[PDB]
Amino acid sequence: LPTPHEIRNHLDDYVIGQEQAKKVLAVAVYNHYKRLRNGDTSNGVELGKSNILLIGPTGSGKTLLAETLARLLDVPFTMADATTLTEAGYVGEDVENIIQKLLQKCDYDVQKAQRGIVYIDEIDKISRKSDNPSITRDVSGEGVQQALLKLIEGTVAAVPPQGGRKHPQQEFLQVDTSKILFICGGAFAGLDKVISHRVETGSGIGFGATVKAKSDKASEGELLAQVEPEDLIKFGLIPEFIGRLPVVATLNELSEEALIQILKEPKNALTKQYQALFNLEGVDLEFRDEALDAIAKKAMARKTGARGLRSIVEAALLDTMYDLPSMEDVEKVVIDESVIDGQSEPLLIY
């Protein structure tokens, strides 16, 4: 029902630098709901199902996009992680409880549950692995992928309502999984290696050949966009699982400009967090416009996405924070680009 522009506008407020990814997600969810309104597809041909695969690097807003999307959509939104999931009958967990968790949000009503959305974070952590002699059995892996795949194929799931007692009592509320949107978002670390081996032309040796220096060799960005089913299978994903997910939303490493906005634009930005911390002690904190550029440059080198920003700030402010409570006559503290480099000390106003 919500227009793609409206969906993208809401995500843009909380997400910065993922305009391309947001467009795919908005169109996918909008098309999915349209199909639900129509009955029997309204035509001979069958409309393709909408299953998104949020593949992206660490700290790229994968979880943020799913969490912020639930606020806009009135449908019930549940979040699970494939790491916790294990084969049925084992000490870890059961995959079927995901449907039950979704029902809890909407007080066990099948009508609302069918229109709900699911977000399986850390999907890459359940990639198929070879057998280990020491281990009794590989509970986590392809076995878990089969249970999740069954829900995508479309199957009614029996759920006991109102927290039914151990007595069966034949309640078994059936909730169809064909209309329930399934989203799997995980950071496929190492996928770049297999993708590069397939799409890298190589460096020639002659005078007229093209020499590729390590500087401009390649990067994960512009490489994941060429992802294909064959590379995902090598990672460990089941081929049937990949076919069931036609929509693929691939995120890109945040740029220097994008990181600068996150430092100050969000309400819960890193700079505002420390400002409130300093204010609790009776001092005000000020960040120069040039300092943000330096912090973003250092964070990009760390390759930890948004989380890298906290590392740079904590290191630069480690010395002052240690001595600021003991010091007196300090009413204002200012930080600039030179302080970020470490050559200079945090400026103090007296």
Binding site: S203, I205, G206, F207, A209, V211, A213, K214, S215
Partner: protein, 192 residues
């Protein structure tokens, strides 16, 4: 007989000849009389190393009494063409062509050993035949003489007139004298 050395690698033990093992470390040996075949071999090594890593610097150990000019130009042109900086080190001696290649190295990366001996002279050639043919070959060698002097002046930094005077006859320069003339930059006395 060339000895064989063992290199420990992740895959396992590997056997290399002493020259190939050093080639793996971006070291090319220029030894003996310069000629077409040895020059083409050196050219192949420079191109091969360029592809492996165009950022790292290549090294050229020159111990030669000189040779053919045309063969040397193939090496000189290849050095300037490829992106990697070529560091030239003189071992034992560096004659007319060896010296031209020595000074042709990257500015700041040209080295010389303390007891090395560098010598630079003008081109020498000869032709037998008709007077008309003599005039042709005589003009060609003079052009090469001017071209070689113009390039040496650029690398060494000396004036063109000074090079013509010094290269008119054989001139021997020691390692410290070469530094002043501009053929090399520094001397490698001891490992630091």
């Amino acid at each position: 007989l060339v000895p064989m050395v063992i290199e420990q690698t992740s895959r396992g033990e590997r056997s290399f000849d002493i020259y190939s093992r050093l080639l793996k470390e971006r070291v090319i040996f220029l030894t003996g009389q310069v000629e077409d075949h040895m020059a083409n071999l050196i050219v192949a090594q420079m191109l091969f190393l360029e592809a492996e890593n165009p950022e790292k610097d290549i090294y050229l150990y020159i111990n030669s009494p000189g040779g053919v000019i045309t063969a040397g130009m193939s090496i000189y042109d290849t050095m300037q063409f490829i992106k990697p900086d070529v560091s030239t080190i003189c071992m034992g001696q560096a004659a007319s062509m060896g010296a031209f290649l020595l000074t042709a190295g990257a500015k700041g990366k040209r080295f010389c050993l303390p007891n090395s001996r560098v010598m630079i002279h003008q081109p020498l050639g000869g032709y037998q035949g008709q007077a008309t043919d003599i005039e042709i070959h005589a003009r060609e060698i003079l052009k090469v003489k001017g071209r070689m002097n113009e390039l040496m002046a650029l690398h060494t930094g000396q004036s063109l007139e000074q090079i013509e005077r010094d290269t008119e006859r054989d001139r021997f320069l020691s390692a410290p004298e070469a530094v002043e003339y501009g053929l090399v930059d520094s001397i490698l006395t001891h490992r630091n």
